[PDB]
Write a protein that binds this ligand. Structure first.
Ligand SMILES: *[C@@H]1O[C@H](CO)[C@@H](O[C@@H]2O[C@H](CO)[C@@H](O[C@@H]3O[C@H](CO[C@H]4O[C@H](CO[C@H]5O[C@H](CO)[C@@H](O)[C@H](O)[C@@H]5O[C@H]5O[C@H](CO)[C@@H](O)[C@H](O)[C@@H]5O)[C@@H](O)[C@H](O[C@H]5O[C@H](CO)[C@@H](O)[C@H](O)[C@@H]5O)[C@@H]4O)[C@@H](O)[C@H](O[C@H]4O[C@H](CO)[C@@H](O)[C@H](O)[C@@H]4O[C@H]4O[C@H](CO)[C@@H](O)[C@H](O)[C@@H]4O[C@H]4O[C@H](CO)[C@@H](O)[C@H](O)[C@@H]4O)[C@@H]3O)[C@H](O)[C@H]2NC(C)=O)[C@H](O)[C@H]1NC(C)=O
Lengths: 74, 212
């Protein structure tokens, strides 16, 4: 499975490693939310990352299904 | 001396703008060297796990429009000027426990004839600390301070750590706590507003431990 990742700048797509079969997207507000919007974290995962009261995490199993919120998935 | 310094200051600011980045061409990314200096832990709130610290944030960058020739001003090669008069990157602490931004004092900057600026404003930071619950007793906490430009993103201004470790050469130790480890890490962070341009931050952290 190919996943988008914020581990690189610019954001890139990578073949997720053995064991990591899900692509995920985490977003949350920090002090700059009102102007820059939520922080965006994208990557690979074996299992969906725990969500917090202030975290928004979504998981999926299709190629590049976790794009930056402003870009089309796939 | 003072006669020439007064002269060059008027010259430098007769047609200066602190609103635009000090680069000759807007394509250029301003390079800012950032170095956190820890001065003293002044308050420890163990119930909320918040520590208040006195610091100084050393910042260095070159201002294209603030150059001159020492020979034209009696050999003067450096001068001190109010930080409020020049463009600044607006580096801010943004994980301030109480308030949403720390207390700072805009002190004077050191400017040399090459346009190189050295600014070391003092500040009072309030940081949340994470208890290191690995070993007993759990008398160790990890406090962090995240710094980054308030408005500019990575394609306009780049902040680079002056060193991998904060400067503790002027740190006044406590009689009850010791800083066991301290380091700064630079990150490239993406926000929902902007899919292509990352925002930069340097996060410094220090692990402090209660003395027996
Ligand atoms: C107390 O609390 C503290 C606060 O919470 C806490 O601090 C945290 O500490 C940890 C360390 O313990 C920190 O983790 C490190 O973070 C580093 C920085 O991370 C950012 O940058 C990377 C890299 O980005 C560059 O590179 C990519 C490509 O790789 C580019 O696409 C980028 O554009 C960018 O490029 C520039 O920089 C490059 C240099 O790195 C240049 O080459 C290049 O030209 C450009 O100039 C990003 O990937 C990170 O993204 C991730 O995190 C963000 C948000 O944080 C997420 O949004 C995102 O999704 C990602 O998850 C981030 O932006 C990391 O570089 C560093 O990584 C190394 O270590 C880890 C684990 O040890 C490895 O997995 C990783 O592979 C790296 O390994 C190298 O280095 C280690 C040494 O540590 C070696 O052992 C290893 O062999 C390897 O060495 C090789 O590379 C070295 C250079 O990297 C080189 O020196 C060697 O010679 C060799 O070649 C690591 O993850 C963390 O950031 C702190 N967090 C905070 C908030 O501060 C602290 O731990 C707590 N303390 C305690 C005790 O509890």
């Amino acid at each position: 499975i190919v996943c988008h990742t914020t581990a690189t700048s610019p954001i890139s797509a990578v073949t997720c490693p053995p064991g990591e079969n899900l692509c995920y997207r985490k977003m949350w507000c920090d002090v700059f939310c009102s102007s820059r919007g939520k922080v965006v974290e994208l990557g690979c995962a074996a299992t969906c990352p725990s969500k917090k009261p202030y975290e928004e995490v979504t998981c999926c199993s299709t190629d590049k299904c976790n794009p930056h919120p402003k870009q089309r998935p796939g | 001396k003072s006669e020439h310094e007064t002269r060059l200051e008027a010259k430098l600011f007769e047609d200066y703008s602190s609103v635009v980045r000090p680069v000759e061409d807007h394509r250029e990314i301003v390079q800012v060297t950032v170095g956190l200096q820890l001065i003293q832990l002044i308050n420890v709130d163990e119930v909320n796990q918040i520590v208040t610290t006195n610091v100084r944030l050393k910042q260095q960058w070159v201002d294209y429009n603030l150059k001159w020739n020492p020979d034209d001003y009696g050999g003067v090669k450096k001068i001190h000027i109010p930080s409020e008069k020049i463009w600044r990157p607006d580096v801010v602490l943004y994980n301030n426990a109480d308030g949403d931004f720390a207390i700072v004092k805009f002190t004077k900057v050191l400017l040399d004839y090459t346009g190189h600026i050295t600014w070391t404003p003092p500040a009072i930071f309030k940081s949340y600390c994470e208890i290191i619950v690995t070993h007993f007793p759990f008398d160790e906490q990890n406090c962090s301070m995240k710094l980054g430009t308030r408005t500019y993103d990575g394609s306009a201004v780049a902040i680079n750590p002056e060193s991998d470790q904060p400067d503790l050469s002027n740190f006044m130790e406590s009689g009850e706590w010791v800083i066991k480890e301290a380091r700064g890490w630079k990150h490239w962070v993406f926000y929902s507003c902007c899919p292509t341009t990352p925002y930069l931050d340097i996060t410094y952290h220090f692990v402090m431990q209660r003395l027996p």
